[PDB]
Amino acid sequence: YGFQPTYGVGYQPYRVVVLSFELLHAPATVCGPKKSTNLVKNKCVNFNF
């Protein structure tokens, strides 16, 4: 390349990352965060511990 700050639009260096997701039959290890709510005591509620 000949990248320079004086270069015009589209002539500047752009850093690009491509993320690919793969789900082979092996047990999963990568998953997004899970939101955890607050807990309340002494109240008839349904829970998902």
């Binding site: 000949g2 320079q4 004086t6 270069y7 015009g8 639009v9 589209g10 002539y11």
Partner: protein, 596 residues
């Protein structure tokens, strides 16, 4: 092995290096001009000569390719552009002598010192000074004397150089499969591509003068009016049936009649249009001037300018010890980089010049779609036409009133419109015979149709015939007036200015017809015309890939070279001059002279 397919890889590899090498050379040039210092000179010279010494091998290798089976028109055109050998065919002695004569005549033309005979210690140059003597003067002797000095102490030594320069150029043209060098300068005005769009060098030789005769009666009316004004100003000096002197034209060589407008003003009661007071009172600085002018392309339909050009390019106020060049230049440095190099001031003429240069920049960013070697116009008459279209549009008082730059209560009438039209036509069309005759003289001196002795006497005769300028003092062969001009001794093709003017009015009338405008062509305005923007941009991006014959098909109605719009533009002027010179004969004859 096939060579048609292998040419693509070589062209791409060459272009990859050419892009950034030419970019670095252009940046070096911009640095040298912007910063006038010894440091920027060495980098300039290294960049320029390294770029040339890199392009030389690319030209050298571009000869094994058999340019006789390339079905790709763009590839064929690019290869033949790179197939050009330039002046690298002669022997070392002849080529080095050609370089020597180029350099020495370039130096000599810039070193013209002319001193007054009674005081030989005060010479003057083509710079302000001797030029200022004829710039605005009311006298007879101080003009003829300065003319004779400038064409005697500069017009006598340029002839021996120019003779051998001409013979060497003709020899090189013969060695380059050209009958004469006029074909070499007419190579740009040739396309031999698709059927119906074919054109030849020899066609222009005839086509130049066919379209010139339709404005000859108008030019004769203009000449009669100018002569009558001259007698009204310079009594007993110009024959009414004859013609006007050479030193009273208004310029160093009478190229234009801009300086003759004040002498030959039609009506001094109605002032010309000037809005510089509006800018100064409204505090329109250079940035405001450029920003307000930026909206015009958006109104026409062109996209907004790319960010970054502001920072890279300087606009105004070089200021302190850090000097800069004020020569108006629009740098297309490559890689999509554009820069501006003006010295902006608060002036209506500066407004028009900024419009012209930003139109040049718009054309530059428009034809950026073409590859590196096709990032150019089809001929030399397309860039200047586009540049001057917007200057003509901004010269319209209607746009001035619309942008609030003038009071909306204007009461314009036929008098001021006719005055402005005459001011325009004193230079727009008056110089066309001058350009035509100079180009014809250069053609016939490169064609070998005349001997060395018959160089200037014929030149003077047909100058009198076409324009009507005779010698204030008789001249012999030791003088050389044509070489005492800027675009004669630096190898400059002078036909660009002739065809660009014809393209300007063609494009303007095409825009006016595709602008839903009714009325005079001079009052036609393209502001807020989105329909003309697409019509212009359809060819602004075509570049050198497409033929100029095809280029004159997306805007103008027809590709024929006829002077239709010039007569329409000065139609009120034509009818105002028609009822002016009722008694004075229109035209001139080539048998009067001031000395006889």
């Amino acid at each position: 092995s096939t060579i048609e397919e292998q040419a693509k890889t070589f062209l791409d590899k060459f272009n990859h290096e050419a892009e950034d090498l030419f970019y670095q050379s252009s940046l070096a040039s911009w640095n040298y001009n912007t910063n006038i210092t010894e440091e920027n000179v060495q980098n300039m010279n290294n960049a320029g000569d390294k770029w040339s010494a890199f392009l030389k091998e690319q030209s050298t290798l571009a000869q094994m390719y058999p340019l006789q089976e390339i079905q790709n028109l763009t590839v064929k055109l690019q290869l033949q552009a790179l197939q050009q050998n330039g002046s690298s065919v002669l022997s070392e002695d002849k080529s080095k002598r050609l370089n020597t004569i180029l350099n020495t005549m370039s130096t000599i033309y810039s070193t013209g010192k002319v001193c007054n005979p009674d005081n030989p210690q005060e010479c003057l140059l083509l710079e302000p000074g001797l030029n200022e003597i004829m710039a605005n003067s009311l006298d007879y002797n101080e003009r003829l004397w300065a003319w004779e000095s400038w064409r005697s102490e500069v017009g006598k030594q340029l002839r021996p150089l120019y003779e051998e320069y001409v013979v060497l150029k003709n020899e090189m043209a013969r060695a380059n499969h050209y009958e004469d060098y006029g074909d070499y300068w007419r190579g740009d005005y040739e396309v031999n591509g698709v059927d119906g769009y074919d054109y030849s060098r020899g066609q222009l030789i005839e086509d130049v003068e066919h379209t010139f005769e339709e404005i000859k009666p108008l030019y004769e009316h203009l000449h009669a009016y100018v002569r009558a004004k001259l007698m009204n100003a310079y009594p007993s000096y110009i024959s009414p049936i004859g013609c006007l002197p050479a030193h009273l034209l208004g310029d160093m060589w009478g190229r234009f009649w801009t300086n003759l407008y004040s002498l030959t003003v039609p009506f001094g009661q109605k002032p010309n249009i000037d809005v510089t007071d509006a800018m100064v009172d409204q505090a329109w600085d250079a940035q405001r001037i450029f920003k307000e002018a930026e909206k015009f392309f958006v109104s026409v339909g062109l996209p907004n300018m790319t960010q970054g050009f502001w920072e890279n390019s300087m606009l105004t106020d070089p200021g302190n010890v850090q000097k800069a060049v004020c020569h108006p230049t629009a740098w297309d440095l490559g890689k999509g980089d554009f820069r501006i190099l003006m010295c902006t001031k608060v002036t209506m003429d500066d407004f028009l010049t900024a419009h012209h240069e930003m139109g040049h920049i718009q054309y530059d960013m428009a034809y950026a779609a073409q590859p590196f070697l096709l990032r150019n116009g089809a001929n030399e008459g397309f860039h200047e036409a586009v540049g001057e279209i917007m200057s003509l549009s901004a010269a319209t008082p209607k746009h001035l009133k619309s942008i609030g730059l003038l009071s909306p209560d204007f009461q314009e009438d036929n008098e001021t419109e006719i005055n402005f039209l005459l001011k325009q036509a004193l230079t727009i069309v008056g110089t066309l015979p001058f350009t035509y005759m100079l180009e014809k003289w250069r053609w016939m001196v490169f064609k070998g149709e005349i001997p060395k002795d018959q160089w200037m006497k014929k030149w003077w005769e047909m100058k009198r015939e076409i324009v009507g300028v005779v010698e204030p003092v008789p001249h012999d062969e030791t003088y050389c007036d044509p070489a005492s001009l800027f675009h004669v001794s630096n190898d400059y093709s002078f036909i660009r200015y002739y065809t660009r003017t014809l393209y300007q009015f063609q494009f303007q009338e095409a825009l006016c017809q595709a602008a839903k405008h009714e009325g005079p062509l001079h009052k036609c305005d393209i502001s807020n015309s989105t329909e003309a923007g697409q019509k212009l941009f359809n060819m602004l991006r075509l570049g050198k890939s497409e033929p100029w014959t095809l280029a004159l098909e997306n805007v103008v109605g027809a590709k024929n070279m006829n002077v239709r719009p010039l007569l329409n533009y000065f139609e009120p002027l034509f009818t105002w001059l028609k009822d002016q010179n009722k008694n004075s004969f229109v035209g001139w004859s080539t048998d009067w002279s001031p000395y006889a």
